[PDB]
């Protein structure tokens, strides 16, 4: 029930402000606004409580305030590590008790573009004996988040049997994705090799694996 902008962005060393609008039932009437930082794959971390107070350990770059029905989180001296989703919440009376905002994605501009590290594994002997073959292409530490992967049997494009994840942000603010190719053991042994080829901003990284 609290309204926050979907997205804010700034460059390093800049200041940004995230707004959190409620009503007199919650934000307007109480000093019970708290703000949370959440990195992808992690629990939320309290940055601010009782509108303006900072838990021990929180950078004094973070500050909070409130005017009428709107509370504000300020980050000054922006650092790449501040990239994260931020959430406000408020006490909301004896009945509703507590409300969250819908979250704000903060992006910090000027992050180095980074090429994917690619690791390609062949099928294990154990899997081959079990009458299957999975080629595993692991793609990491790339930014920005968009890649397209294409598989090749020898030099020929393979479409069938491919499952590829959507990239999703890692700890470091860089992305990871996986792509899986399913083959019969017979296909695996009747090519010279297979390749996983990752395109990331005009530029291709390719890895190749061969039977034993």
């Amino acid at each position: 029930a609290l309204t926050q902008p979907a997205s804010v962005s700034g460059s390093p060393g800049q200041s940004i402000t995230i707004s959190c609008t409620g009503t007199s039932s919650d934000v307007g009437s109480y000093n019970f606004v708290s703000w949370y930082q959440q990195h992808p794959g992690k629990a939320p971390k309290l940055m601010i409580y009782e509108v303006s107070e900072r838990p021990s350990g929180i950078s004094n770059r973070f500050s909070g305030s409130k005017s009428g029905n709107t509370a504000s989180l300020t980050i000054s001296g922006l650092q790449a590590e501040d990239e994260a989703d931020y959430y406000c919440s408020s006490y909301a009376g004896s009945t509703t008790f507590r409300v969250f905002g819908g979250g704000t994605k903060l992006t910090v501009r000027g992050q180095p573009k980074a090429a994917p590290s690619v690791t390609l594994f062949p099928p294990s002997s154990e899997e081959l004996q079990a009458n299957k073959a999975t080629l595993v292409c692991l793609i990491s530490d790339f930014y920005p988040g968009a890649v397209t992967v294409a598989w090749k049997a020898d030099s020929s494009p393979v479409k069938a049997g491919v499952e590829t994840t959507t990239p999703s942000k890692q700890s470091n603010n860089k992305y990871a994705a996986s792509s899986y190719l399913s083959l019969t053991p017979e296909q695996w042994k009747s090519h010279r090799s297979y390749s996983c080829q990752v395109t990331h901003e005009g530029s291709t990284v390719e890895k190749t694996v061969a039977p034993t």
């Binding site: 294990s124 999975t134 692991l138 499952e163 999703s168």
Partner: protein
């Protein structure tokens, strides 16, 4: 360190019941109000319920009223969420958190436990070794439902260089993931590397040597 160890999540049919536990230590659990907050995959935080320090007063979101019941055992430092009548829309990661004060901010959060409300039945994964200055070796954890699966290496002894990847969701409705670890090339064929795979919903516990 302050710890909020969650359990009791996993797979449940629509209409079914679970009980989440959150075991606290390294603070005086009986002094503080506690909350459960949930987060559906790719979505925002939603407050579920809170309970005052004595456990005598409790508060619950309208979305959950009459279905979930928060409670605590101060003696055993544990916070519970009894969840009855579960629906698909309750699928979410559930966090417990210690609140600085009742109705105020939450200053320590547990790591979350995934609750999957689905009619699909559990399936345990197959596990396969991934082998080839620096080198990468891994384990392939294939065809399981629901999430999550946990992977450690050498029983938690190896942590540096470990990257467990987000799982793919196949057309079939089954998940697969890989965990990889980068090591010095010189380590191969001297050090022993073993992935420990756990898929709690199927009680699958697997150790694979990787050569």
């Amino acid at each position: 360190e302050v710890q909020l160890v969650e359990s009791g999540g996993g797979l449940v049919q629509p209409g079914g019941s679970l009980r989440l536990s959150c075991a606290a230590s390294g603070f005086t659990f009986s002094t503080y109000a506690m909350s459960w907050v949930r987060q559906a995959p790719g979505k925002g935080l939603e407050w579920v319920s809170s309970i005052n320090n004595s456990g005598r007063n409790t508060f619950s979101a309208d979305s959950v009223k009459g279905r979930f019941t928060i409670s605590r055992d101060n003696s055993k430092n544990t916070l519970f969420l009894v969840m009855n009548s579960l629906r698909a829309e309750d699928t979410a990661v559930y966090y417990c958190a210690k609140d600085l004060r009742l109705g105020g901010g939450s200053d320590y959060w547990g790591q979350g436990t995934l609750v999957t409300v689905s009619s699909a039945s559990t399936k345990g994964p197959s596990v396969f070794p991934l082998a080839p200055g620096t080198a990468a070796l891994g384990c392939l954890v294939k065809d399981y439902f629901p999430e999550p699966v946990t992977v450690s290496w050498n029983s938690g002894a190896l942590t540096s260089g470990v990257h467990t990847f987000p799982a793919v969701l196949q057309s079939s409705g089954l998940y697969s993931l890989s965990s990889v670890v980068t090591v010095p090339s010189s380590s191969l064929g001297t050090q022993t590397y073993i992935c420990n795979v756990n898929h709690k919903p199927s009680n699958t516990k697997v150790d694979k040597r990787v050569e």
